[PDB]
Amino acid sequence: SIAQARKLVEQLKMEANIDRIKVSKAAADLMAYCEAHAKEDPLLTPVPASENPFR
Amino acid sequence: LDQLRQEAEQLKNQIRDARKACADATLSQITNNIDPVGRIQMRTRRTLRGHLAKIYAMHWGTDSRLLVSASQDGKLIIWDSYTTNKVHAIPLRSSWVMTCAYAPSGNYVACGGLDNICSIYNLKTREGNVRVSRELAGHTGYLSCCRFLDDNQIVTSSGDTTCALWDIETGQQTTTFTGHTGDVMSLSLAPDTRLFVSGACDASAKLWDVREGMCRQTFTGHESDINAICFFPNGNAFATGSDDATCRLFDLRADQELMTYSHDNIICGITSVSFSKSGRLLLAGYDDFNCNVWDALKADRAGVLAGHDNRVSCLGVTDDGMAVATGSWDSFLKIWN
Amino acid sequence: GCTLSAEDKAAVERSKMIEKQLQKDKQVYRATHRLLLLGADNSGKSTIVKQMRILFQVDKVNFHMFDVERRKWIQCFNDVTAIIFVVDSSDYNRLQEALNDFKSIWNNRWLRTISVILFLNKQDLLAEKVLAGKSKIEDYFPEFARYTTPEDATPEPGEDPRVTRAKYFIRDEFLRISTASGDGRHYCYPHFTCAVDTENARRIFNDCRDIIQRMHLRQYELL
Hints:
This is part of a larger assembly, with chains A, B and C. By secondary structure, chain A is mainly alpha-helical.
């Protein structure tokens, strides 16, 4: 399985070639998304009793 | 082969050191300024009951009103949570279905399991009777998970260590995804339907691409089989649940884990993982016959959902985000909210 | 009925119809003994499935078999009535691997409750082997010479005492697994099996009923 092993190796090369980013900006984006749709999200804060159609 | 092993080892070392350089701090270390979410109080508003055996998998519909449940009795019932009334009770030739999926258009429902076939039952028919539109087949293992990109394509996990992108109209694997050394337990599609993640028994998760058919990125870290996998609502990050009793959040852009939801009290494998509408929370059903509502940015038990006596096999948040649902081996599917 | 809910009345009718069929299928489901066939590749489950293909079902009680690669799915289900583990005792060398497989099956904590209806299969060919001189168990399982035929282990008339010695050696090597793990929650019932045997089916039914009774004896604490 030398050929398949080399194909796996080149797949690892392709995975390594990607350009990564820093964790801080990713966490900032996650934080921004969390608070951007806070009002729309109906499970963080229970919606008005009449608003919820599951009553 | 030996030279291949050496170069693979050193290349993985470059990958790890690149991630370490990119890993300045953890998510909790950076977002400690955030206030705690609070007490997430949820109760069983409704209980879809009527199945005859373990409910393996469920998929909330795009309507967020109709939800499929696949059950080992050999059933796919489409339930209407707004009315508790069943709409279709699609029988199964194969009793062993471990994946059921609802198409975004709502016209078809997919089921699969030990039969090694992904059957696409048709919901909207002129006659009104559900029948097999297409029995996608060609795998040599059980289909653990399958989802719809659209009304004519479907990405299916399987037990032959190969994911596939089946075409409904024709029935051939347009693109095949190989590279896992074990059964691919779960997969999820990104909201843009261009990328999708998949976690396998090889203790590995991947970001398989549906266009170039290559593993864009490979995320690891789990110490056991990854039973569940999801996405952040933006699609830029995702969370995995392992038999290691751990849920780990991996970010696509950062190419490394962000936070590990785990605790000494919680020792049991995760069976299904899903987020909320805004992604603040993390809803994960565990083997402790319960569900744990964590905070995504803090890894704290914001709440516990209790009421299933057997294991919570399947979990799903509504497409809009109204309520979350848990289907257990108790042969019942509750609708938490 | 009053039929006053319009589209919702149609939905109510559909739900009631579906519940009716759910109960109708519950009638069948609550009475069916579901069984799985963990037969090895060389074990000879082909004979049993051929016999079942001949005609499964006994009287009015239903039975439903599944047959079958690593097992990530065997632990997913615990509602199986019992396990049918065909073993080809004719092949002595593969017999040890079958014994290890039975160890794995019997010691799986997920299937801890589940009893096993074990089949020593193709034992007539074992007789043909052992009557000849080529087949020597002393090479593979040397403890065969240390074995003695139990008068308690009732033999069959017109059978070679060495045939019985060998056969009982295989079976109690398998039953060391069951007796060692005397959990009580699950018991192993071995049965000699041979090809072109229509009787095999009824044995299962018999055995199946037995397990059910024990389960009741466990729910009511009598046992």
